[PDB]
Design a protein around this ligand. Structure first.
Ligand code: CD
Length: 55
């Protein structure tokens, strides 16, 4: 667990949902990369939700 992880949160928007690219830049295992997404409130839900075009 590296503190620099806090800096990654600031650029989380820059990497968007591409956690794989962020892991390569910080060289961290999917555990921390997925967790950073798991903490962001915007990337927590995938796409929108149950609201969309459905018939
Ligand atoms: Cd985010």
């Amino acid at each position: 667990f590296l503190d620099g992880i806090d800096k990654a949160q600031e650029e989380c928007e820059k990497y968007h949902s591409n956690w794989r690219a962020m892991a390569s830049d910080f060289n961290l295992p999917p555990v921390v990369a997925k967790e950073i997404v798991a903490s962001c409130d915007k990337c927590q839900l995938k796409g929108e939700a149950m609201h969309g075009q459905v018939d």
